Symmetry: D3
Subunit: 150 residues, 6 copies
């Protein structure tokens, strides 16, 4: 379905470096539709749930600490295969090993400061969206450019 | 003061044409700091107050109708002389008469579809910000790049 | 009317410097629709008529000589106020005095090599189009992005 | 030989989305020389021959139908290894699986709307060029930037 | 003469903000040729002579202090009317009043941090070049793109 | 360590094609810090040592001849994993086989004219830096953007 959605968050380092518009521009050009958008400084509560998956790891605390250290730009994009597509556009965990052309490949150098996060699955996406956004904050009726899907 | 703020709104046509990231990128590069950001579909109530200034004019109704016809990306930027600066970067009322380099000059062709709106004064900016944003939605402590102001 | 059209020609120097896509991209982003397009090496006959206006001037010969010295990319764009708009985007006769943001302002330095030409009027545009293109080479039914005109 | 040539066609969806200049700009920057260029609305006849290879497949009809549904920008580029090079720059069949940096990777989301087509071989290129262009429409003497080949 | 030259210096703030390549790219695209280039941290001695013109003004000290506070990228560009042209591309003294499209117009907000300096005259250019560069550091034989001058 | 450094040289073909600013801009955006920079026309002596590794090969002479045929822009960048990172951003030996997004992938077509060179190892980097730069020409105290490393 072309109605798939994913959650993307530009971390405090991405915001601080002025990469928000550049990042949004990439997904806009790809043809994905913005369904939700907002800047905010996450609470520890939100941060702990978002990173629940790494809670057994020692670096979990560092993650939670940083994400709540400054403004975060939260977004929801809609489109066919957007979850996997968004991840490909982001690159890999290590920005230094990410290919030129991808977001982290073009702008990142440290794992601990890798600019942006994207849901790694539909289930994960579903969870994160309901975590960061209230249903009323999401576009209900969505219509991509008419030249995008056959 | 470098703490001046202005209200910018990418109208439904700007959003529909995928120009949000491109527009945000311009103000980010200029050095202005994003203090508020969110996408939404404005209510007639919000739309009528926002355009209060043209309420005696017949085109007022067309304005209100269009702004509420689709998603709008609302933003607040902070910085020295940002109100006047943002307007210069946008161009003039008629996109066709706007200089290449400005937003409307580069992307617009019709007055009725001129992509983005920016407060025309500090007083107007003050009013519009409190209209579109709740205080809790705005960044309290702001810190621009350290190489921007002497 | 939003059906106005203008003739644009990237001269041999613009082509040689690889500026064709960059130039077309500017008018595409503005919202104008490509109605005709083709690369060719103009004949002296076509060149003399195109520059008829300067035929009494001594530099007329230099113009005709250069335009026929290499490939030229001929185009027709459609849209509201496109004739005047296209000229503004091009800049002024002297590339050095053209504003940054305009085509010649960004890429030119010599009057004798000013990259591109655009009709200076509707009447001139009408004449040039019929000069460079056969009616069958022009798009009949044109439809701009639906978010461009109110 | 640096005189190799390939056929590239921006499909109706690429044209409709205003990606022509952007696409041409990529091949220009790479150093390839434009030998042929023109916009046109293909006839069913031309469309059926162009896609002859898929004529035994059921999706063949959909291909022919779409390519003839709107304007197409046809081009011929010359240069060393241009056929294989152009394909790499385009990406793979599925735009969603194409790498960021490639044309489809940056702008496409659906197989049925993958923006551009490029010959997959020299033999195929030879055939397609003679299909879309008349010999008189192609540049005879070509000269790339002098700093491109040793 | 197309052999005119001007001195351009990206101040410590321009370097710190990662705008060097972007700035050089603008003059390269314009067609001007780089005749000298180097990064360095200026001595007070060099700084005082460079700003000699403002030595009677109280802000003179602030200028000298800042330019020597970090790395500076010094460059010399050659071309027709480059001195006046370079200034137009830079913008005006107040970055906030500079037009979008110009360097300061796109990236600056404070007079005290206006990214780059360019000689304001041929005489001034002549003086500054001999101030920052040794003759052996400048290209002797220069050859612009052959499609730039008639 | 985030203090790793690598040597990058834009060959005469890269300079001649006006790609210096574009190339520097890529490494600046990545977050690497410029520690050394200068344009020069290398002597045969410098050229022979730089290419010492291929001195037993017949193409060695062609390398030395070309690098000394025109201006070269020499640079030193600092950052975590910059040596390997810079190579990834450059692409592979054959520009035609380099991925879109990488420097050679976007701008090159011939092995003998592949725009830029980057040290292939820390040891090689150490050697090349001391070859092209004098210690006094390199920045001593370096400070990347504060949002780059955790």
């Amino acid at each position: 379905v072309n109605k798939e959605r994913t959650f993307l968050a530009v971390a405090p380092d991405g915001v601080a470096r002025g990469l928000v518009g550049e990042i949004i521009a990439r997904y806009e050009k790809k043809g994905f539709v913005l369904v939700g958008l907002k800047q905010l400084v996450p609470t520890k509560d939100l941060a702990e749930s978002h990173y629940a998956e790494h809670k057994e790891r020692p670096f979990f605390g560092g993650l939670v600490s940083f994400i709540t250290s400054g403004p975060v730009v939260a977004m929801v994009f809609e489109g066919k295969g957007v979850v996997a597509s968004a991840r490909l556009m982001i690159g890999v965990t290590n920005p230094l090993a990410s290919a030129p052309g991808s977001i982290r490949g073009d702008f990142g150098v440290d794992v601990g400061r890798n600019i942006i996060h994207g849901s790694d699955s539909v289930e994960s996406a579903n969870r994160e969206i309901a975590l960061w956004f209230k249903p009323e904050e999401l576009l209900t009726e969505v219509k991509p450019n008419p030249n995008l899907y056959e």
